[PDB]
Design an enzyme around this catalytic site. Structure first.
Site, PDB file in Angstrom:
ATOM      1  N   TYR F  55       0.850  -1.190   0.000  1.00 17.84           N
ATOM      2  CA  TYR F  55       0.000   0.000   0.000  1.00 17.84           C
ATOM      3  C   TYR F  55       0.885   1.239   0.000  1.00 17.84           C
ATOM      4  O   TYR F  55       1.457   1.612   1.028  1.00 17.84           O
ATOM      5  CB  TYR F  55      -0.933  -0.003   1.206  1.00 17.84           C
ATOM      6  CG  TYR F  55      -1.932  -1.137   1.217  1.00 17.84           C
ATOM      7  CD1 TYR F  55      -2.272  -1.805   0.047  1.00 17.84           C
ATOM      8  CD2 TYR F  55      -2.538  -1.540   2.401  1.00 17.84           C
ATOM      9  CE1 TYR F  55      -3.187  -2.842   0.057  1.00 17.84           C
ATOM     10  CE2 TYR F  55      -3.452  -2.574   2.421  1.00 17.84           C
ATOM     11  CZ  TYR F  55      -3.773  -3.221   1.246  1.00 17.84           C
ATOM     12  OH  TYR F  55      -4.684  -4.251   1.267  1.00 17.84           O
ATOM     13  N   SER F 209     -13.538  -4.522   0.645  1.00 15.51           N
ATOM     14  CA  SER F 209     -14.357  -3.914  -0.395  1.00 15.51           C
ATOM     15  C   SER F 209     -15.825  -4.266  -0.176  1.00 15.51           C
ATOM     16  O   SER F 209     -16.521  -4.638  -1.128  1.00 15.51           O
ATOM     17  CB  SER F 209     -13.897  -4.366  -1.783  1.00 15.51           C
ATOM     18  OG  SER F 209     -14.655  -3.733  -2.801  1.00 15.51           O
ATOM     19  N   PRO F 210     -16.339  -4.149   1.054  1.00 17.05           N
ATOM     20  CA  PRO F 210     -17.733  -4.547   1.306  1.00 17.05           C
ATOM     21  C   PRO F 210     -18.755  -3.660   0.618  1.00 17.05           C
ATOM     22  O   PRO F 210     -19.950  -3.979   0.659  1.00 17.05           O
ATOM     23  CB  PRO F 210     -17.853  -4.446   2.831  1.00 17.05           C
ATOM     24  CG  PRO F 210     -16.871  -3.385   3.200  1.00 17.05           C
ATOM     25  CD  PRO F 210     -15.713  -3.558   2.251  1.00 17.05           C
ATOM     26  N   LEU F 216     -22.146  -0.010  -4.064  1.00 16.51           N
ATOM     27  CA  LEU F 216     -23.217  -0.327  -3.130  1.00 16.51           C
ATOM     28  C   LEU F 216     -23.638   0.870  -2.286  1.00 16.51           C
ATOM     29  O   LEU F 216     -24.424   0.705  -1.348  1.00 16.51           O
ATOM     30  CB  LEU F 216     -22.798  -1.489  -2.227  1.00 16.51           C
ATOM     31  CG  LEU F 216     -22.646  -2.822  -2.960  1.00 16.51           C
ATOM     32  CD1 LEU F 216     -22.158  -3.917  -2.023  1.00 16.51           C
ATOM     33  CD2 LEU F 216     -23.963  -3.214  -3.612  1.00 16.51           C
ATOM     34  N   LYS F 219     -23.171   5.716  -6.926  1.00 17.25           N
ATOM     35  CA  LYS F 219     -22.312   6.507  -7.798  1.00 17.25           C
ATOM     36  C   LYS F 219     -22.664   6.300  -9.266  1.00 17.25           C
ATOM     37  O   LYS F 219     -21.859   6.646 -10.139  1.00 17.25           O
ATOM     38  CB  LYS F 219     -20.834   6.175  -7.574  1.00 17.25           C
ATOM     39  CG  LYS F 219     -19.885   7.261  -8.061  1.00 17.25           C
ATOM     40  CD  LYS F 219     -18.750   6.696  -8.897  1.00 17.25           C
ATOM     41  CE  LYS F 219     -17.885   7.813  -9.460  1.00 17.25           C
ATOM     42  NZ  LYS F 219     -16.889   7.304 -10.440  1.00 17.25           N
TER      43      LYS F 219
END
Lengths: 318, 321, 318, 321, 318, 321
Positions: F55, F209-210, F216, F219
């Protein structure tokens, strides 16, 4: 007659403190005499029979084998122990603890004894020509197939005991249960470390020749011997029992004794020997026999010196 | 010129056939005396030093450590062996083969010797108060951490050796290398079965007191007394025959016995150390070795260790009894 | 006639230094001739018989099988060794060391040999199509059920030996006992590392074709060969014995030899070959044969160079 | 531009198909020479350095270590491999695969290389004086402590490889990764069975001396001499045919053999290093590879390694002999 | 007719690339018809028979069982594979992979098949009610007793394969050899990870229903399907062979295929299906079928995304 | 006030049902931004931080480490989890699950985080170039040395999980605790068998990434597109029904699925972090959970993962098909 029952070493099987030896079956005692002795022994309450394939070249096993079939009720109580190792013939492979011979010797004993399973199958002597791993694997195969219940040793020394015991443990085999040593007031050299080796393994002792072949009965006849023999005689006449019952009562109360193997030949001697179970020697007499017959090795490593060197006082210090 | 090298038991380490014992360092031999002995020993070509934490309450180890510090060249050749087991203090746990005591005994030995790794760490004697499994685990922990290279025993009997050996195999631990027994012409009872136990496990012998504390050199119940002198007489008869020291005959015999890895000398002076090390150049004849073997043979009862019990267990390769 | 008895490798079984090969039973020697050879061999004192299921498509086993039943006394002394691996037919699975085939091949050999158990069951050749783990597990199941006593190898190379030996050790199986290599004064390439691999495993050697099919007997008839053949001839005539007895005495004294497999076809040749057991070559003649027949590989890795590179002087230094 | 990457045997480490040998560092090539070679090798894209404690008595390792210190960027890519086994001194224990010696050999290698972890630690040769179990235990101890990543062998034969491999599996140790054998068109005897042993164990080959010490490049009992020249003639015939170096043909052949992980180059000058590394761009034709294979094929006796013994052990998948 | 022989997974047993399915024996094909099909299959050279105890409630096994006894020569070449798991009755324990049922189901199949040993005993489906450890221990006991040669799986998923494979390895059991998945050009979802799981274990695939029950033969009659069916038809008519031989040749050349299980019902279809062994598709046609029938899962985790995420370029870098 | 605590898979460590993902630290969120997020998360009662070496090329770890240094009280509660596997550089060995790379990746993670022990070290993805045995051995070495507490996987499929799990059992290693899969209403394919593999091994799920990367929340081939919107429509319909965020419905659903240990939030602002953490107080009704489950159910072919293959393997406890 409150029976003296003991465990067959670490196992769950129980045996009477006295065991009937069949060394004379087929030799000094024919099939008739031998049949009589078995009847008396079981009539007294004993349940332990010890024989060997080489005892008269199988005649001993064969005698026991058909006494078992003729008296089925006692046959269902008897713990049968036989051996294999020594020459059943003069062939190079008619001998030893090899997988080749033990396979044939175990089937031969089963045949002559007339049993589907032998309770205690004992190696009659160490066999340096056969790796102990080979012997143990065969025994483990016999346990699983059911041909035998337990196994034990004879003519094994200290590191013999420990090596076999620990290898079986590491390989997941069953633990050995007993050792059959020549033991009595005139032969206590197994105490140098052999006994301790058995105790470490939780194994019991099946001492044979507790009378020294008759030297402790008084009949026979060189310094230690007669001092020892004289002590047994002073106590027997003091207590009013036979010399045999003294020496036998002494052997029965020694450390790690599972059952004493009697080698009596006549009904009288068997009834006399077995009468020793009710003979309770005194701590003063027991100490007297322990002292006059104490083995006297060199200081090192089995003597007093080596024992004090290896001792550890729990409070510390020299 | 021709040095007798032997494997440290079953391992890949090599040691000279004679090992310098240090029992006297810090007692009968002061630092300078000890340092001269060490110097003479390594000038001879030796590479094996045996000590113990209990020798003069750790001073033997301290003397040896200062010497190693002072002799970097020899220290790189030295195979250093010490021990733990006997009391270093009067406390209930200043003793034993327990994890509690050995962790402190090994650390103190490393500090006194000024080493990060002891080549051969030896249990001075059996300890019936500590499971052998507990001792073996600790030793295995010391191998992985590098504090010790190999381990061995002293004052172990037959089933002790086989038990610890076989349990090490079962646990995946390293195998023990040596037994350090008291062994000489006058004391051969480790031959009743202990030697065979060692041979089965592949271990070598580090005999100590090879001269019977001066009895096999000359410093002058029935059966024992007789054998001692029959032995002493044979040694000096072979010694005078070959024109060498009585100590050299005794040592040559010891170094020629089965399974002997290195003979631990207990010399206190430079003179007697040189003589003893000279035993390496003494090759006893066949007759001489046999004469010494027979006159010093142990004589136990026939069963189980005597001639009778031996012939019983013997198996002729041809068959038949 | 003081018998030359040796151990079947690491096991507790003993065999005579010479073993009777039955490759000719049912081929150049019919059932009658083969029966004669077995009678003579055992009359001499040998106890070791080696056959194979493919030797004449089982005719060899079948011949041995009924000689054993016809002479029961010798049958109880004989160590029987047969093999399985090669095609017993042209089916895709009539071949190999697979569990599928060995199961059928072991039962077939037992049937044709007329035995409840085979003493030494040998893999006739490596089988790259079958994982050694599969072969070893089958053998271990056969040991436990009693169909076989021991097992050994044939046409295995160095890493074949070590891999199988170490896998059996790790899995708790029984250790292999022997290897049957083609070996003699004209073929010593197994010494490059195959012998050492057996010695590391404590395995013994059962060399077959010690006469090179007859090339070392002198009858037959290219540089090394005749130098070697000439040496055997110079010594035999110097000692006053046959060429066969020379080459045989040489094979018997090589490292790790358990028993030599004789392939003699007639009673005369068998009596001559067996007479080599009393032929004791001299160290000077033994060295002479060792030199003129020493394998000459490349320096690396099996030659002199690779051996000195891997050598470690115990005193250290280059 | 297109680099040939291969797994370090069975492990997850990746190395270039060519490895920089350092046998000459500190001998024929001084520090500056060695440092130029290392620079040129890593500028080519290589990441594999092979040395040994015995190369110039530790100077090869010291030169490599100073270079790594001076090239942090390349040092982060370098897979460093060294060895221990042969004598670093004339003492009885300055040698061998024993725990006693390897603990000191590995430590000295780490210090001379200035590393906390050696990527590939190799046993320079078999040691019949040390149980393979003792060596394998030490190496396993070095993996857990982080001193080494992987381990491999050199100068091991068929049963050596299978034995150590299978015992590692049995003990739960890490598997060995590589064998570093002397292997070239002139010496293919490791193909009698050793290569197959390596393939069974999943190990890759780190062949060294791929040019026969200059014989396969040009520097000019019966059967052996003949094969050598038939080989030398084929190489230069294919070299002149393709218009490349004789060394490049030899190297291309070596890097194309079965089980080859990385070819260890033994270049002493920048010029010959560049030429040798150029072998990577040489793709031998099918016919050329077959012609070289046949002319250099080993020719042992039929049994056990010859054609006869091979056909005997072969099993047709269809059945029948 | 050069036979296409392959290994039964990792084992040493060999099977023909095509295997005869007996699902129709006793259902659409009576004992007579089924006998004909077996005769033709073996006449062609195949050696692989697959049945199941539930195929018509044992009628399939019983048919095979007596064809084997009636033609002993082919019986000695045949590799027999049957299954157990599904209900042989409506009892609560007439079903599953429990030691209770498999014991009875294996003895029932052996009985109805008339064999001492079954070559390949396959679990017909995963049984969540029975710990895999229990199932594997039973199978291992069957291997040792000889009731079975090898074992394999059916209706197992990826972690099913790996869990069983690794447990058997850890416990010293024999390794599984095969998986029997429903597989063809219209059902390739096992490629998501199930195939990879078998390849990791060295297991082979026995795909059944390679014709999709007949949908790929062209006879039958929803977008992907007809695109796939049309491709098979364009190639078969381009090459001049049947649709079945195309789809079959495709299945035979897919990764990790040990043998294709044909479910043909008539002699004509069997002769046509088997004729596909000589059909060698082109790399261009093989790619054409691979593309138009490529499974299209979600990107994660089995799709293109999850595969590129898990990929490791040997040269490093993203 | 009422915090949802769950066991870290099969271990005895406890973590809040929501975990702070740090993928943005050092990229979209600078140090101050990241530090505010961490502060807000721990002020909420959270104790679970998940990062990775890749990251922002180690800056996420560096930011987290400086924060821990600055917040001793929170650092004592923090369960810190990071990863290694993907490239930290363009070298052939700056990558992979090899012993060579992980030893350097784990060390660099410990240094950047300023920790002596990482609570949960995760393999970022499968590595077919490294034997799983090699990776598992390294991880076991890291447990004994104390560098890591537990280990887990990410981007492992069904047989990967069962294989590594069962081999750990066989080797005596510690059991893996977690799988970190990409999992949400829009991506439920890990339910074909991977979830069951995890349940068999006792592992918990760390879904990330829920929210489908904002899909969800709001957008704004045939079958897939249709399901996505049927899902998006149900979420906002249940969201408007209950008067909560669309993100809160999605998160409540995720945290309620089988085997979920902690949901990894990927919030970039304090505002959206608060909203997401508010999902814990949202208890979806039975009907709502069923409506979301059905509309987002995976739809593979019947065999092997579809309804057909499932009913085939099912065994009625009563018997009969």
């Amino acid at each position: 007659s409150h029976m003296d029952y003991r465990k067959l070493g670490p196992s769950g099987t129980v045996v009477t403190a006295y065991c009937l030896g069949t060394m004379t079956f087929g030799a000094e005692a024919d099939e008739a005499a031998s049949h009589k002795l078995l009847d008396d022994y079981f009539a007294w309450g004993g349940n332990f029979i010890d024989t060997a394939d080489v005892y008269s070249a199988g005649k001993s096993e064969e005698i026991i084998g058909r006494w078992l079939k003729a008296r089925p009720t006692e046959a269902r109580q008897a713990i049968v122990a036989t051996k294999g190792r020594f020459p059943m013939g003069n062939g190079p492979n008619d001998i030893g603890l090899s997988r080749r011979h033990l396979s044939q010797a175990l089937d031969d004993s089963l045949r002559r004894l007339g049993l589907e399973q032998i309770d205690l199958y004992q190696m009659h002597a160490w066999d340096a020509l056969t790796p102990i791993e080979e012997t143990l694997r065969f025994l483990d195969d016999a346990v699983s197939s059911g041909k035998i219940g337990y196994y034990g040793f004879s003519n094994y020394v200290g590191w013999h005991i420990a090596k076999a015991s620990e290898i079986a443990k590491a390989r997941g085999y069953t633990r050995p249960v007993t050792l059959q040593p020549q033991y009595n007031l005139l032969m206590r050299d197994i105490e140098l470390e052999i006994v301790a080796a058995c105790q470490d393994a939780g194994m019991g002792l099946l001492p044979w020749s507790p009378l020294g072949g008759g030297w402790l009965t008084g009949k026979y006849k060189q310094e230690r011997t007669w001092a020892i023999i004289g002590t047994v005689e002073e106590i027997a006449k003091a207590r009013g029992v036979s010399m045999a019952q003294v020496a036998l009562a002494w052997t029965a109360a020694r450390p790690a004794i599972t059952s004493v193997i009697l080698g009596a030949r006549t009904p009288e001697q068997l009834a006399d020997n077995l009468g020793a179970m009710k003979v309770e020697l005194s701590g003063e007499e027991m100490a007297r026999l322990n002292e006059v017959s104490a083995p006297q090795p060199l200081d090192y490593p089995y003597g007093k010196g080596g024992i004090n060197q290896r001792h550890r006082k729990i409070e510390g210090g020299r």
